[PDB]
Design an enzyme around this catalytic site. Structure first.
Site, short mmCIF file in Angstrom:
data_model
loop_
_atom_site.label_atom_id
_atom_site.label_comp_id
_atom_site.label_asym_id
_atom_site.label_seq_id
_atom_site.Cartn_x
_atom_site.Cartn_y
_atom_site.Cartn_z
CB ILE A 121 4.43 -50.37 2.04
CG1 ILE A 121 5.10 -50.01 0.72
CG2 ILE A 121 3.60 -49.19 2.51
CD1 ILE A 121 4.13 -49.96 -0.42
CG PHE A 148 -1.11 -55.41 8.38
CD1 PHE A 148 -0.04 -55.38 7.50
CD2 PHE A 148 -1.29 -54.33 9.23
CE1 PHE A 148 0.84 -54.32 7.47
CE2 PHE A 148 -0.41 -53.26 9.21
CZ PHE A 148 0.65 -53.26 8.33
CB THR A 208 5.29 -57.66 5.26
OG1 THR A 208 5.23 -59.08 5.06
CG2 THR A 208 6.08 -57.35 6.52
CG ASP A 246 -11.34 -56.10 9.11
OD1 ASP A 246 -12.01 -55.65 8.16
OD2 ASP A 246 -10.54 -57.05 8.98
#
Lengths: 231, 285, 261, 230
Positions: free
Chosen positions: C15, C20, C22, C128
């Protein structure tokens, strides 16, 4: 115009959700029934489907409870006495429907699209009368529907589209016949799979609104078939 | 370390104070619940009960188990669990009498097994399992709580009886009747309480129906004259789920299957039945 | 102590791939997701990034936080989250653009300001937050997740330039996005809402300000939204005493959290 | 005879045919019983459903007659049907009303139960008062509150200030004043005097079962916001 006042009184009685005082006033357009157009034809179908539709849904709950005997109480005969009270007006709510079909609607219908519609609905109200029949009536009314279904096929096999939703709905309807009346899923599977594949093939040029409702019953053929391959 | 400093939690309405469960309502960071001590002085049994239950809810992080949020000790010993809206499973069966589909009768029965192995992979004995300590979150996904007797693998610290007074007569192991010096609670003694749930779940009835009191029950649990009569099954019980519960609630305590097996059987029923038993007709427009 | 042994995670379908890392759609005791780092050569920052990141998530146990399940590094380094049964909030308002109802469109804004208040109570800096990782389990509750870079206008000025008051400048942009349904680029004057509140026009304006010192603290953003809930009308007609649920059971059903006889 | 007569409508309860459910309950009431709480509850679910099926069709028929401004024939086509439900709706209530006043209200002895029918007595009067017109409207509206206030006075001598009949009377009391009488100034007065009478209670105990009463209490705060939004 005497027609439109008889349809306006029956176009709002379902919008107000009271079908019984619409069924007793939707049949009145058949008494001067020169030509039933399709835009008020199915108005009669929605009425009579929902009038008996409350009763047979009420019927199945009472039969589910009466065979929940809790051993055998000295009271459940009243549950069986109440059971007949649904069956009494079950027979009196259908007899006019099949009764008004062959008198008026069938011997005037010039299009075969109408002929397969009225004969299917002719065949249907024996099926809802088949499960309530329970005796020699069970082995007399179902062949009436069987030939009514069998008369319904030739006007649909030829003289209709391969993807017409009345024809697709008919084999959808007639598949449900054979199991809980004649107890043969092998006929039922072999009747369903054909028109299932016959209409998925050549889904090319049809408009999507005819594709819309026909997928609403083609996927109903899947969840019907998967009950049959499981048994 | 989630020792909660006093003043953060705001206690509201009471809910129940019966058999040692003095549960309340809170409001800290969304609605929570709080179980407090009844008496003000914890006896050596009460302090030991809190000093394991604060650890057994430390160790469980799984969605289908009841969440754990904190514990306070300054005003009184409180346990900050979650607050699950919905209704219990026992209320759904024999009180509101909801007619359950056989599709959502196994996704209840799967997620009480797909989450209970997380107590067994992390090796917790859910010592007192009942059919009413399961709870549904808005009637679609399930949550299991009531760790009030929950123990961990205790071969290193011995435990006494502290038992034989509960409402769990209708789900009671024959090893519980024996009460040996070796602790009769085990992984193998845990699936039997899982089994009598599945009988009481699938047939939609109350287990051990013909029972006036517990006089005839407890004589015949460990002897071999009382048995759960699963032959009074529902109308549509598929042949796999009809057969695992035969070997599940075995009298032979080592014959009972392992818990990752009883998930592995029920995960085979994926393709079972898409629709209801009623074969559909043409639709009404 | 949430080290689980190697050879447990039946990994699955990938996905998304990017900055970031996986994500696979795993399966361990029911379907889970796994934030996997595909690399096998351990860079000395991720020797240090991983050990503090699980030091964050070891403490947060709450409804609106996406429940931390496990972690491993022995075949490969990853963490095991929960698996929400629904799309994101970036999905709902931009991708498929699903229209919502105002009595609930701020009732997720209670529950994102509810859950982040559990972060600052544990003194955790998110650093974030955007709409792209706001997840909606069953479309009822709202889960906060994927806060990897999270240490237990200063960002666009580089003046650590982060505190408690450093995400609330972005937290206004979350609740602004609910109102107008279009990302900016001073998003204030576009705030024509259906119910058209005034306090929401106020509280949006009292978070996105320039003067970074005077930003409001968080437990007066929970409390000044729960007040705003009770003045948005739940029903559109009067009601009566309903058809009563006389069934023999009328108590409050405490038996999840205790025993019963 | 008597107990099996209860069983007839209780069988029809899950059968979802409420008309025969209503007809069975009035038939046992010819004897002087002072009926218990396993029977008097069954008429309220019955007769609210026989009425509410008609009433939810009244609310759309009186809508759809105003939804058009066109021909007078189709307009008068609606008004001829809007009285068929209306002539039906009145004859249901006098079966209830003529039952309870002739014997059952004098047999309504205990004030944990005598308050209960007095709630239902004027409540059907309000159902008539939504639809009845002319001087007939004023003769039941003044009979509604007269049938309401002599029950709310028994709520002072009632047992518990959290009892759900005492709640549901006030929820029925306040919903009258906004909808029928159109007195919004006295509307929020009854809810505030009834909600805050209750929230100051339930502090020591709720050992009596009370989850039925708390959903009434959410209903009080729910509709108050639109009552205060004006």
């Amino acid at each position: 115009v005497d027609k439109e006042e008889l349809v306006q009184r029956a176009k709002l009685a379902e919008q107000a959700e009271r079908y019984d005082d619409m069924a007793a006033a939707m049949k009145e357009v058949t008494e001067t029934g020169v030509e039933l157009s399709n835009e008020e034809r199915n108005l009669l179908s929605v009425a009579y489907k929902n009038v008996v539709g409350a009763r047979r849904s009420s019927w199945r709950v009472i039969s589910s409870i009466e065979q929940k005997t809790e051993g055998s109480e000295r009271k459940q005969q009243m549950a069986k006495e109440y059971r007949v009270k649904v069956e009494k007006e079950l027979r009196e709510i259908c007899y006019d429907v099949l009764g008004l079909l062959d008198k008026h609607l069938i011997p005037k219908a010039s299009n075969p699209e109408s002929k397969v519609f009225y004969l299917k609905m002719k065949g249907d109200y024996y099926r809802y009368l088949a499960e309530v029949a329970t005796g020699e009536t069970r082995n007399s009314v179902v062949e009436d529907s069987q030939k009514a279904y069998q008369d319904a096929f030739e006007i649909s096999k030829a003289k209709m589209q391969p993807t017409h939703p009345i024809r697709l709905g008919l084999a959808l309807n007639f598949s449900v016949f054979y199991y809980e009346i004649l107890n043969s899923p092998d006929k039922a599977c072999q009747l369903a799979k054909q028109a299932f594949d016959d209409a998925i093939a050549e889904l090319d040029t049809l408009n999507e609104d005819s594709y819309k409702d026909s997928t609403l019953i083609m996927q109903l053929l899947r969840d019907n078939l998967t009950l049959w391959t499981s048994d | 370390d989630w020792e909660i400093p006093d003043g953060q939690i705001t206690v509201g309405q009471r809910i129940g104070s019966g058999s040692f469960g003095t549960v309340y309502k809170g409001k800290w960071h969304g609605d929570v619940a709080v179980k407090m001590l009844n008496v003000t002085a914890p006896t050596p049994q009460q302090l030991q009960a809190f000093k394991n239950e604060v650890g057994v809810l430390r160790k469980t992080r799984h969605v289908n188990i009841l969440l754990f949020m904190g514990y306070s000790t300054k005003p009184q010993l409180a346990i900050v669990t979650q607050w699950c809206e919905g209704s219990s499973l026992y209320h759904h069966l024999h009180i509101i009498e909801t007619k359950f589909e056989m599709i959502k009768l196994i996704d209840i029965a799967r997620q009480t097994a797909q989450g209970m192995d997380y107590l067994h992979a992390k090796s917790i004995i859910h010592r007192d399992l009942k059919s009413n300590n399961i709870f549904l979150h808005e009637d679609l996904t399930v949550k299991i709580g009531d760790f009030g007797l929950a123990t961990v693998k205790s071969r290193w610290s011995g435990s006494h009886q502290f038992e034989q007074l509960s409402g769990s007569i209708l789900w009671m192991a024959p090893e519980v009747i024996r009460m040996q010096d070796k602790n009769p609670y085990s992984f193998q003694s845990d699936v039997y309480a899982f089994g009598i749930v599945l009988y009481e779940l699938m047939t939609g009835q109350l287990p051990y129906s013909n029972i006036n009191n517990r006089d005839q029950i407890i004589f015949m649990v460990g002897r071999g004259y009382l048995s759960p009569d699963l032959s009074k099954v529902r109308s549509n019980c598929p042949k796999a789920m009809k057969r695992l519960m035969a070997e599940c609630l075995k009298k032979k305590r080592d014959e009972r299957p392992l818990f990752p097996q009883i998930l592995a059987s029920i995960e085979l029923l994926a393709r079972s039945l898409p629709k209801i038993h009623r074969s559909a007709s043409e639709p009404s427009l």
